Write a protein that binds this ligand. Structure first.
Ligand code: 3DV
Length: 269
């Protein structure tokens, strides 16, 4: 079939770093993909990690092409955009929506962790929605291997985004990868349910973080969160990463397992 490898770049989807993401549409088939354009003036590791990934709640990597110094990553197009834009400031979103997004986020993170990959920058800007509002973890530029040949490596590079980062990353030279991603998922849940972030960073000089440690959940954002999800947050947002709840136990949590949401036409007679 002639022309089937030709794609028109038709819309800017995002920028940041020294790159852009373009909506690309196939000339023949009209398939829409996202193309991440990175001018190499790191991306080899991101491509390598991307090639490992095959799960319904992770942005699919289709392949890559390089033309000189511009590298092209072909990725699953997510027409719903960022979870960030489903969060109403100071409100959040309906609790059943947040629970459903949280389920899909856990499935994605369970998958990455089982193949030994940590994302390291989980936040609503990096959680994309397809046309059916299915959540997809995106952007593996800060991602790394924390397990190989069944042997765990401790991390020591400070990275991520301060309001989402686990306190051990600010306090300790080395830390386990998995509790860090769990923590950031808890801050995402807090955001979805309160429409605000609890602190600038989880440090002993952050008053809002100190209030949480002192259990002042009569304050915001906690006062906006029902007691059931708040009880999950109490288990996730635990300062000691060894005492923090693990994903297997998140999946046994009462709120996590609470029926809340009807499924996604019909007629009467
Ligand atoms: N794969 C994607 N699909 C949709 C959108 C997007 C993001 C915001 C608004 C919008 O309408 C679309 N963004 C991407 C995307 C996001 C991040 C990456 C990445 O690997 O950095 C690659 C692609």
């Amino acid at each position: 079939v002639p022309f089937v490898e030709d794609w028109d770049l038709v819309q800017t989807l995002g920028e940041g770093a020294y790159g852009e993401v373009q909506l690309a549409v196939n000339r023949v088939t009209e398939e829409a993909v996202a193309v991440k354009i990175v001018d190499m003036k790191n991306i080899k590791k991101e491509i390598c990690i991307n090639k490992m990934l095959n799960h319904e709640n992770v942005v699919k990597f289709y392949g890559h092409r390089r033309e000189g110094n511009i590298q092209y990553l072909f990725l699953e197009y997510c027409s719903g955009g960022e979870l960030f834009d489903r969060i109403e400031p100071d409100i959040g979103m309906p609790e059943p929506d947040a629970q459903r997004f949280f389920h899909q986020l856990m499935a994605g993170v369970v998958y990455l962790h089982g193949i030994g990959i940590t994302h390291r920058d989980i936040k609503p800007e990096n959680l994309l929605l397809d046309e059916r509002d299915n959540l997809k973890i995106s952007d593996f530029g800060l991602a790394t291997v924390f397990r190989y040949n069944n042997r765990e490596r401790l991390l020591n590079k400070m990275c991520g985004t301060l309001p989402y980062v686990a306190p051990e990353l600010l306090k300790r030279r080395e830390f386990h990868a998995e509790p860090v991603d769990v923590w950031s998922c808890g801050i995402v849940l807090t955001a979805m349910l309160a429409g605000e972030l609890p602190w600038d960073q989880p440090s002993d000089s952050c008053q809002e973080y100190s209030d949480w440690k002192e259990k002042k959940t009569y304050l915001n954002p906690w006062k906006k969160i029902d007691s059931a999800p708040l009880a999950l947050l109490h288990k996730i947002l635990v300062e000691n990463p060894s005492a923090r709840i693990t994903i297997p136990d998140i999946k046994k949590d009462r709120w996590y397992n609470k029926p809340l949401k009807k499924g996604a036409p019909r007629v009467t007679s």
